[PDB]
């Protein structure tokens, strides 16, 4: 069976990727902070991987260009319009105690092709510039938002995304691998290396918690896929393959719905998305492939290979399934096209 694809050099380290709408994408990324002359921007791209030249395939629609000795960004989303990035400011800067406005809200005007700056907040007070912005996720109805920090233990921060202001904060256990939103945004699930930590966004408080997972699984990606029902993958710590698991939530209460082994092919995951149907996930491996899964029957179903150089950072689905979007620190981005409900 044979998928249409195409690729692009976006000319920086790219680090995230979000489909604005069907065929509009958002890739974020950049040189980072030295005198490189790699710009750090935010690019939007209309993408149709049917036309005959790279440039017809991927259109520049509008750049923003972040300041050339920032950090470059590092997590970014987008929902009803409001788009967030992570990006440290100069890490000398950071550490003289500055300030570090390190979460941005951008707009895309749709009418004219223009990125807009709107604002941003230093919600860390961090000083040290190791440290960066490693998950940004917003709800699907826009009204709220989770970031977490690259610093273990970690605090994840939920967030209202239009003024920036901070709901609550979150002191997790240990490093939080993953997040992600109920579709009401009621509920936020984030996972460490061992547990599944299920918290209300409005009152954060606990829901529920599940610690009992198999001693040999390295819990790397959440998604939620029906209203109460989350998708995990984990990756295992002694021989090599990617388990999915479908687990429903309940007050106080989880339970295993079902779980397969997907595949022995690759050691560990950078990055997932299920689509807006809850059919089809998507995985980037380690070692540069992406990976369809149809989640009915929990099966990879296709695998592509090499399909960037390196360090594949981000997938995202477009919005009707049409596309698979990848991008990586290679410069890269990767697009496939899927037959009309591909998923079943
Ligand atoms: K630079
Ligand atoms: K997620």
């Given at each position: 069976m044979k998928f249409v694809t195409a690729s692009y050099n976006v000319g920086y380290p790219a680090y995230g990727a979000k489909f604005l709408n069907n065929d509009t994408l958002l890739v974020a990324g950049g040189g980072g902070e030295g005198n490189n002359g790699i710009p750090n921007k935010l690019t939007v791209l209309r993408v149709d991987p049917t036309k005959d030249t790279e440039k017809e395939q991927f259109h520049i629609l509008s750049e923003f260009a972040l300041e050339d000795n920032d950090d470059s960004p590092t997590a970014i989303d987008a929902s009803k319009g409001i788009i967030l990035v992570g990006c440290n400011e100069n890490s000398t800067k950071i550490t003289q105690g500055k300030g570090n406005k390190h979460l941005r809200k951008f707009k895309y005007d749709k009418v004219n092709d223009q990125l807009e700056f709107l604002t941003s907040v230093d919600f860390d007070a961090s000083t040290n510039a190791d440290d960066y912005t490693k998950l940004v996720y917003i709800s699907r109805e826009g009204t709220v938002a989770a970031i977490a920090s690259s610093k273990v233990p970690a605090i994840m921060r939920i967030i209202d995304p239009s003024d920036l202001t901070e709901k609550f904060e979150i002191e997790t256990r240990g490093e939080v691998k993953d997040l992600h939103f109920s579709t009401d945004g009621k509920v936020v699930a984030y996972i460490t290396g061992s547990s599944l930590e299920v918290i209300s966004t409005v009152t954060g408080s606990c829901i529920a918690r599940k610690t009992?997972?198999?001693?040999?699984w390295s819990l790397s990606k959440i998604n939620f896929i029906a209203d109460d029902t989350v998708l995990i993958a984990a990756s295992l710590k002694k021989g090599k393959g990617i388990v999915l698991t479908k687990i429903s939530i309940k007050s106080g209460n989880t339970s295993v719905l079902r779980s397969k082994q997907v595949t022995n092919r690759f050691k560990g995951i950078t990055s997932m998305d299920v689509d807006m149907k809850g059919e089809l996930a998507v995985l980037a491996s380690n070692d540069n492939s992406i990976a369809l899964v149809k989640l009915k029957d929990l099966s990879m179903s296709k695998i592509f290979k090499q399909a960037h150089s390196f360090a594949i950072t981000e997938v995202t689905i477009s919005p009707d399934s049409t596309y698979v979007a990848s991008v990586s620190a290679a410069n890269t981005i990767h697009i496939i096209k899927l037959p009309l409900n591909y998923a079943n």
């Open positions: 009992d997972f198999d001693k040999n």
